[PDB]
Structure formats: C-alpha cells, structure tokens
Amino acid sequence: AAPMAKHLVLNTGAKIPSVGLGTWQSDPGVVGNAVYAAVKAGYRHIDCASAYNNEKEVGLALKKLFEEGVVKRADLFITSKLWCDHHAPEDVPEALDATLNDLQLEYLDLYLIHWPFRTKKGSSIGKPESYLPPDIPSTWAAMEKLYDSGKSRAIGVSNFSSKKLGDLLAAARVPPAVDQVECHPGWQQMKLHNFCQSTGIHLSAYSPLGSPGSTFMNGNVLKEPIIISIAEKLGKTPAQVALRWNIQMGHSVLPKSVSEERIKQNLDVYDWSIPEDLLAKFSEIKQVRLLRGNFIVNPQSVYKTHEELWDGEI
Ligand SMILES: C[As](C)(=O)[O-]
C-alpha cells in the first residue's frame, strides 16, 4: 500500500506515482537502458503503448530490473494503450494480450483507449479507406471486462476532450480512472483540469515540456521568459519548473527522455516548490495546443475540424 507523498489517488483507490517515464518516440534501441536507468534513479511509473513499437524493449528492461531485485512487480505502475485498429470487442483483449506478452507482464496498472478514433483491424491510419466510426461504449464495455478480470487494474482514456470524457462517464459502469492528455505551461487544460477535479478522473500530462524538437515559437515552451525567470530564482532548470507546475496542479507528468542525466533531473520535482506568487504568473503564457490531431481531422473523418475533435478545446 503506497504512501501519500508523490502519488495521486485514482477513483479505484489505487495510487498512481505522479512522475512516470514517457516512452513515446523513444527509439527501441535505447528505451531499454532508459527504463532501467529511470527505475534505478527512483521512477516507479512507466508509460507505454503498442503504437510506440518499443514495448518488447521495455519488457526486457523490466525483466532485468525484477531479476536483479531492484524492484518487485508490485512496486511499479505500468500503463499501456489500445490502438485505433483494435476497438472491436473481440480485438480489445487480443491487443492487451499482445502488449502483456511484449512487456512480459501478467497485468497492467492502467490501460487507455489511445484516441477517440477507430480504424479497420490491421489497416494504415494514414489512409481514409481505413476509417470506421468510433463506438466508444462498445469498446469501453470490453475495457470493463479487462478491469473485472484484473488484467488491467484501472482503465481510462487518452486525448478525450472534457465533453467526450463526460459523455463516457455518463455511459459507463466503471468510470474512466484517467484521461491522459497534452498538458504543459503552453497548454494548461484548465477546463479539463476543472472537469476532472469535479468528477474524480485523474489528469495525466503527456508532453509536459511542450515540444523539445521545436523552436520557442513552435512549441519549446521552456524558452518562455517567465519559466526561465522562475528557474533562475529557484535554482532549478526550466524543465524542472515546467514539471513542478504540473505537479502543483495535482497532475501526474510523463516526461519522455532516453538521456540518463535528463531522466534523473526530471524526477527532481518533489523536495521544493514554486511559490504561489510565481505560480500565478503562468497565467500570462500564450496557450497553443501542440499535438492537434491532424492525422484524424480531414474531410473523410468523423472529425472534419479540430473544434469537432476537441469539442472546442483548441
Ligand atoms: C502521447 As500520444 C500523441 O501517444 O497520445
């Protein structure tokens, strides 16, 4: 039974560690070492997905950590995600079993619907011929079976707007435990934050450093003067300040890195805080969604506009 500090409580009663290692766009050749180093450094939460094409390499690192006695299975919170082409009820358990085979696990702590979007089994999502209308209640009922069987100890969604999340909550027997979404100082998700707090759904922040591959204007939010300024005042890195902001909002954060030193720095967000007067200044940062869902917004999609995909949250 995990402690209070450094965790949030899910609506299941389970505790989610408030920092996890992101593995989105982590190259299969280096993710193993990243996972091993992360857990060695004190991470107790790994965020994975079938779609990231690297769960086998994550699995090898978990196996190593367990065999070396660094951690036991019960010490880790492991998340994976259901891809768009496995939304049919018989395909949901097939996807989870494949994921569990790759991660070399018997259960997940959390399993998420990756997007509110559906495609034909084994199709390429880049082609409109692949598209199918979502049936989230149907897919969710299949997810509820995994919850009931203990194959996933919690179930949730990813990239659901407040509206879509609310609609699922109204329809579901088992409420979503988590909505995993882009959340960082440049996209603070105050509407979804408030909705989540009001309904008991956990907001988990992906891309908590914005877009490190970008220039300042294109999404490197760590170049915001306010963040730099606060970083200098508190003797921390801009990344640390961005992450701590999210922590103080009561979110979990999922910083992705394959650099051991960056992985270590990204965990140093607990033994200090941002003063209330400095925290207020985050309200001045320009708000722009960086992961806009372009791949599923087009004339052939159920979402003809970004406003439709995000129910106005853009
Ligand atoms: C962090 As993502 C774009 O795989 O939902």
Per-domain boundaries in the chain? 1-314
* Contact of 94 with 108, CB cutoff 8 Å: no
**Distance of alpha carbon 105 from alpha carbon 58, whole angstroms:** 11
The rounded Å distance from CA 95 to ligand 1 centre is 17
CA angle 138–142–145, rounded 5-degree value:
140
The rounded Å distance from CA 52 to ligand 1 centre is 9
**Distance of alpha carbon 78 from alpha carbon 48, whole angstroms:** 7
The rounded Å distance from CA 182 to ligand 1 centre is 8
SS (H, E, C) the chain: CCCCCCEEECCCCCEEECECEECCCCCHHHHHHHHHHHHHHCCCEEECCHHHCCHHHHHHHHHHHHHHCCCCHHHCEEEEEECHHHCCCCHHHHHHHHHHHHHCCCCECEEEECCCCEECCCCCCCCHHHEECCCHHHHHHHHHHHHHHCCECCEEEECCCHHHHHHHHHHCCCCCCEEEEECECCECCHHHHHHHHHHCCEEEEECCCCCCCCCCCCCCHHHCHHHHHHHHHHCCCHHHHHHHHHHHCCCEECCECCCHHHHHHCCCCCCCCCCHHHHHHHHHCCCCCCCCCHHHECCCCCECCHHHHCCCCC
**Distance of alpha carbon 184 from alpha carbon 173, whole angstroms:** 31
The rounded Å distance from CA 24 to ligand 1 centre is 7
Is residue 291 packed enough to be buried (19+ CB in 10 Å), middle (13-18) or exposed (0-12)?
Answer: middle
Count of CB atoms situated within 10 Å of the CB of 314 = 16
Best of 289, 291, 292, 295 for a ligand 1 pocket test (most atoms within 8 Å of beta carbon): 291
Approach to solving: X-ray
AA letter at 156 = G
Q: Is 7 annotated as a binding residue?
A: no
Tokens standing for residue 87: 């939304």
**Distance of alpha carbon 258 from alpha carbon 27, whole angstroms:** 8
Residue nearest to atom 3 of ligand 1 (CA): 291
Count of CB atoms situated within 10 Å of the CB of 211 = 17
The rounded Å distance from CA 67 to ligand 1 centre is 30
End-to-end CA, the chain = 39
Task: Examine the residue annotation and report whether 111 is marked as an active-site residue of this protein.
Answer: no
List residues bridging with 202 in a β-sheet: 178
* Contact of 247 with 269, CB cutoff 8 Å: yes
What is the sign of the dihedral through the CA atoms of 282, 210, 203 and 241? negative
By DSSP bridging, strand 110-113 and strand 155-158 are parallel
Residue nearest to atom 4 of ligand 1 (CA): 24
List residues bridging with 82 in a β-sheet: 113
Burial state string for 119-142 with b = 16 or more CB within 10 A and e = fewer than 16: bbeeeebeeeebbbebebeebbbb
To one decimal, the resolution in angstroms is: 1.7
The residue numbers preceding gaps of C to N over 2.5 A in the chain are none
User: Quick one: fold of 1-314?
Assistant: TIM Barrel (3.20.20)
Please list every protein residue whose CB sits less than 6 Å from any atom of ligand 1: 24, 49, 158-159, 206, 291
**Distance of alpha carbon 271 from alpha carbon 263, whole angstroms:** 17
What is the sign of the dihedral through the CA atoms of 303, 305, 307 and 310? positive
Among the listed residues 295, 270, 226, the one whose alpha carbon sits nearest the alpha carbon of residue 83: 295
* Contact of 289 with 182, CB cutoff 8 Å: yes
Burial state string for 254-287 with b = 16 or more CB within 10 A and e = fewer than 16: bbbbbeeebbbbbbbbeeeebeeebeeebeebee
Catalytic residue among 36, 43, 52, 206: 52
Ligand 1, residue 254: give the atom nearest the CA: 1
Residue nearest to atom 1 of ligand 1 (CA): 206
Half-sphere exposure of 146 (CA within 13 A, CB side): 33
**Distance of alpha carbon 97 from alpha carbon 95, whole angstroms:** 6
Best of 52, 125, 206 for a ligand 1 pocket test (most atoms within 8 Å of beta carbon): 206
**Distance of alpha carbon 265 from alpha carbon 242, whole angstroms:** 12
CB within 8 Å of 251: residues ≥ 6 apart: 8, 18, 183, 193, 202, 203, 204, 205
Count of CB atoms situated within 10 Å of the CB of 81 = 25
Ligand 1, residue 115: give the atom nearest the CA: 5
**Distance of alpha carbon 198 from alpha carbon 290, whole angstroms:** 26
By DSSP bridging, strand 15-17 and strand 7-9 are antiparallel
CB within 8 Å of 288: residues ≥ 6 apart: 186, 187, 219
Among the listed residues 44, 48, 50, the one whose alpha carbon sits nearest the alpha carbon of residue 8: 44
**Distance of alpha carbon 289 from alpha carbon 231, whole angstroms:** 23
**Distance of alpha carbon 57 from alpha carbon 28, whole angstroms:** 6
* Contact of 247 with 268, CB cutoff 8 Å: no
* Contact of 161 with 313, CB cutoff 8 Å: yes
**Distance of alpha carbon 97 from alpha carbon 76, whole angstroms:** 19
